[PDB]
Amino acid sequence: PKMKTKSGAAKRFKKTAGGLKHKHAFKSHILTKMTTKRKRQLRGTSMLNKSDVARVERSLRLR
Amino acid sequence: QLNDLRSAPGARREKHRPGRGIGSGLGKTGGRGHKGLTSRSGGKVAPGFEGGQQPLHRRLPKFGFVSLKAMDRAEVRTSELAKVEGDVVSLQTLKDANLINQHVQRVKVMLSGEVGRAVTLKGIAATKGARAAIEAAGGKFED
Amino acid sequence: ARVKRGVIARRRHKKILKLAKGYYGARSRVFRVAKQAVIKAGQYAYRDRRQRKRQFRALWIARINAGARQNGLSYSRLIAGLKKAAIEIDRKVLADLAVNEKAAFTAIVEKAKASLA
Amino acid sequence: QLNVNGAQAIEVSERTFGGEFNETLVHQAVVAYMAGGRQGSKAQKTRSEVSGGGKKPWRQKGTGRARAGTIRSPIWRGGGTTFAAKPRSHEQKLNKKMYRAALRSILAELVRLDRLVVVADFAVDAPKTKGLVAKLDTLGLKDVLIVTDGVDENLYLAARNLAHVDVRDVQGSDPVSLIAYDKVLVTVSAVKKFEELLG
RNA sequence: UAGUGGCGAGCGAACGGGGAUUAGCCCUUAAGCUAUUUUAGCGGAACGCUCUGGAAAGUGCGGCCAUAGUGGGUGAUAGCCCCGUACGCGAAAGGAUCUUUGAAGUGAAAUCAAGUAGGACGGAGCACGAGAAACUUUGUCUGAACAUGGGGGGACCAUCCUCCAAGGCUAAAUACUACUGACUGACCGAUAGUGAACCAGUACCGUGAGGGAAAGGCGAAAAGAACCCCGGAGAGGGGAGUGAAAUAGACCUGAAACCGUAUGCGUACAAGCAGUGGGAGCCUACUUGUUAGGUGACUGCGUACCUUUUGUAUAAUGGGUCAGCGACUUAUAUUCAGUGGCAAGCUUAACCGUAUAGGGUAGGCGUAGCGAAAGCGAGUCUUAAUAGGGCGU
């Protein structure tokens, strides 16, 4: 199959049947500043935004 | 008559040739525009490249793990139990009726419709809602 | 299937050099000059279909004006004289009656003077 | 239904014969057969295979002539075709089921146009061409496609020289020759086997 | 895909399935064995009158051949005029391939394994860039147990499984074409196709290695012009003869730019992208003038084309004109629309095949999700959650 995916975006984007999951950023290595309201609202696993879909679905070889 | 027949209207189109005339609409540039990268031979922007801003797939954290053991999993809907023959749903009986796969060991059965006939599951382990259907619709769940 | 374009190129060249005959020197015989003088002579023929209508209207007016001064008016008071009444006659057929049918023109002019305008 | 010239009405299944004539399907099937692997062997050569041409003739700047870098280039004299064609295959893939629905649809309008002559049995005796010419004079036919399943060396050695008469097997019958060859001559064995193939 | 990777660009397995092909044996060294085709040939069937034509294969009108009817070429279009086309015979003599066969190698045909396994630094090959790094390798330095041993199962260790390392031999499926021979083409048709249809790797250009062109066609047949007149005793013409045709004459057709010669109409007091709108007169034809064609005195409006650009008549770019060639293609993967097949199911890849049919369902996509994972399932994850909320039906 002459269509190699990228290896990075296959490790930051799992694919479910309701879009693409991804972990939130900014949560490492300086954490004694931030208020919890900000820590517990970056703990989940969001789904990807619509401006970003057709950019990633070319990096992952879906197109 | 081979002199007669032709396809449906709209089924064939005719491959517009860029670079011919001025009346055709595609002349002298071919839909590219003017000077720049996406106007030249091999004007391929690399996929995922943004221009110099840090791209999406190098800002977000790696978070996966791939176990090993879903390489041996499969599952069968309750509706497909009427697709084997011989009414003994073994492990190999799902393979020769090519309902599952080769090289699959552990199989479940989940609820997806009525079964249709009384079969004896053995070797495979259904969910809670599935075994409430098979035990009522004449089947027998042994091992 | 190699196609050689030496025979359908020639028909399109002779079709240009037919429209461009009667021209001076090198505009009627070589093709990279005779293509410009066929397009340019088509723009002039588009503009001058409008300017034809302006060069006769300005010729009809200046013939009524000369013929109606000899009887005793101007042009501009004659047109107000005919449209006080209702005579409804073009400029094209007044300037025919000015030259050829001169006695019928005088029988028109006297009625504009009776219209007193 | 089907009127054998001898006698008695073989009365076939109307699932195959007497179907609706989809001709968008048939046009796709005769196009894919007819472009089935042609012999295709075109062979033009590019900028990189022509003999020689590997130095700049006349220095970049300062000469007065336009910038050139190779004597063997598409702008020049015998330099090279700029998009040369190397050999390649021509083959569609229609389907198994889609090939049969086209075959079943030309075999309905073959019946509705009376281009189909069903006979009891067609058997020549000696491999001699003038014997078969007389036997086609009985049915009143010339330019015939003969469709049978028992293609015998009496029948095959004849009509390798006849001008418009062609003999085939029931699995060698392709969707071109059933639309060419104005009248088709089947036997009562071959109408059976269309129910084993097409249903 | 798991992995590997300044975890960047990227590189990328195996296990398991489906096929093609179908043998295993043992000591170079304890003690070795290592019946056909082919280069030459031969036979090979079926047609007559009638028109036009320089010449019939063509127009007509009939008949015959066939295991050979889309070949070539004969004064124009030939199944039946000529050469050939389907099957057999072969061959003094060589060649090769299968055999017996001869020797010997092709080699059917006995063990086994010490500076060896492992180890320590330094490198390679393993998909695997010191990484928890297994395994194979060998440049330097070392070093075992005797098949009651041994080494493998991706750091490592116990338990189970599975194989005998330090000696050898092997057909088939496979890769290739400078050289042949048949055949075939939705391949080229002398600026294309080999650089090369022509005496081409030649002429020429280089001290050399090396580079490297341009160059086809009279007619069915030379019947290729006896003889006369002008000319330098020539070159070239004018006749005459051949021919269906010499404006087919040493060459089929024969265009454009370029150059001329005749005939008509306009131009020697008038200023410019040379045309367009109106328009006198003259000419030649036709019924004789709108029946049409050719010139255009006079006069109104009018600063070429392309490309770059916020704008070009621009004193910005490019072009001496003509004739030939000269620029969005292919292959393999994948997404969206158009039109089709079967439909909770649709479809096969290699490979077999009397071979565009048929077989081949391995594999893929779907019919169910949520979760990092085990796992549980019309729900599941987070959570002390059964509360809320995310995703899903």
Assign 3-class secondary structure to chain A.
CCCCCCCCHHHHCEEECCEEEEECCCCCCCCCCCCHHHHCCCCCEEECCHHHHHHHHHHCCCC
User: Distance between CA atoms of D31 and D35, rounded to whole angstroms?
Assistant: 6
Does the C-beta of D92 come within 7 A of strand E? Answer: no
Which of D24, D176, D179 is facing B7, going by the closest CB pair? D24
H helix or E strand, kind and range, residue C56: helix C36-69
Query: What does the domain layout of chain B look like in residue ranges?
Result: 1-143
Single-letter amino acid code for the residue at B84? V
Collapse the DSSP code of D16 into the 3-class scheme (helix H, G, I; strand E, B; otherwise coil) and give the result. Answer: coil
Are B2 and D179 a contacting pair at CB < 8 A? yes
Contacts of C29 (CB under 8 A, 6+ apart): C17
Does the C-beta of D100 come within 7 A of strand E? Answer: yes
User: Distance between CA atoms of D89 and D37, rounded to whole angstroms?
Assistant: 7
Q: What is the dihedral of CA B29, B33, B37, B40, to 10 degrees?
A: 0
Q: What is the dihedral of CA C46, C52, C58, C60, to 10 degrees?
A: -160
CB D74 within 8 A of CB D82: yes
Residue of D nearest to B11 (CA): D24
Q: What is the DSSP letter of B92?
A: S
β pairing state of A14-16 and A19-23:
antiparallel
Contacts of C78 (CB under 8 A, 6+ apart): C64, C68, C109, C112
Are D30 and B1 a contacting pair at CB < 8 A? no
CB atoms within 10 A of CB B94: 22
Considering only CA atoms, give the Rg of chain B: 29
User: Distance between CA atoms of C109 and C64, rounded to whole angstroms?
Assistant: 11
Question: Which nucleotide is nearest, taking the CA of residue B110 and each C1'?
Answer: E377
> How far is CA B63 from each of CA A11, A44, B67, rounded to the nearest angstrom?
7, 12, 13
Are B5 and D26 a contacting pair at CB < 8 A? yes
Total residue length of chain B: 143
Q: How was this structure determined?
A: cryo-EM
* Interface residue of B45, B60, B67 to substitute, partner A, most A CBs within 10 Å: B60
Q: Which domain holds residue C74?
A: 1-117
In angstroms, the separation between the Cα of residue B10 and the nearest Cα of chain D is 11
Are D176 and B2 a contacting pair at CB < 8 A? yes
Single-letter amino acid code for the residue at B51? G
Residue of B nearest to D177 (CA): B2
The domain tally of chain A equals: 1
B63 close contact with A: CB closer than 8 A: yes
Length D49 CA → E240 C1' (Å):
62
Which of A6, A28, A45 is facing B48, going by the closest CB pair? A6
Contacts of B10 (CB under 8 A, 6+ apart): none
Does the C-beta of A63 come within 7 A of strand E? Answer: yes
> How far is CA D173 from each of CA A37, B5, B125, D100, D149, rounded to the nearest angstrom?
78, 20, 53, 12, 11
Does the C-beta of D40 come within 7 A of strand E? Answer: yes
B61 close contact with A: CB closer than 8 A: yes
Q: Which two tokens stand for residue C5?
A: 């374009």
D24 close contact with B: CB closer than 8 A: yes
A55 close contact with B: CB closer than 8 A: yes
Crossing angle of helices C76-84 and C102-115, in 10° steps, is 70
CB D70 within 8 A of CB D53: yes
A/B interface, count of CB pairs below 8 Å: 38
CB B107 within 8 A of CB B76: yes
The domain tally of chain C equals: 1
CB A10 within 8 A of CB A60: yes
Examine chains D and B and say if they touch (3+ CB pairs below 8 A). Answer: yes
Does the C-beta of C59 come within 7 A of strand E? Answer: no
Does the C-beta of A23 come within 7 A of strand E? Answer: no
Does the C-beta of D160 come within 7 A of strand E? Answer: yes
CB A39 within 8 A of CB B73: no
A9 close contact with B: CB closer than 8 A: yes
In angstroms, the separation between the Cα of residue B12 and the nearest Cα of chain D is 11
Q: Which chains touch D (3 or more CB pairs under 8 A)?
A: B
A29 close contact with B: CB closer than 8 A: no
Q: Which domain holds residue A24?
A: 1-63
In angstroms, the separation between the Cα of residue A13 and the nearest Cα of chain B is 8
Chain D from 74 to 103: CB within 8 A of any B CB = none
Resolution rounded to one decimal, in angstroms: 3.3
Contacts of A44 (CB under 8 A, 6+ apart): A24
Residue D171, strand partner residues: none
> How far is CA D121 from each of CA D92, D147, D148, D168, rounded to the nearest angstrom?
37, 11, 9, 15
CB B55 within 8 A of CB B49: yes
User: Distance between CA atoms of D90 and D124, rounded to whole angstroms?
Assistant: 40
User: Distance between CA atoms of D54 and D79, rounded to whole angstroms?
Assistant: 12
Single-letter amino acid code for the residue at C109? V
User: If we measure between CA atoms, which residue out of D170, D115, D168 comes closest to residue D146?
Assistant: D168
Residue of A nearest to B48 (CA): A59
CB D89 within 8 A of CB D37: yes
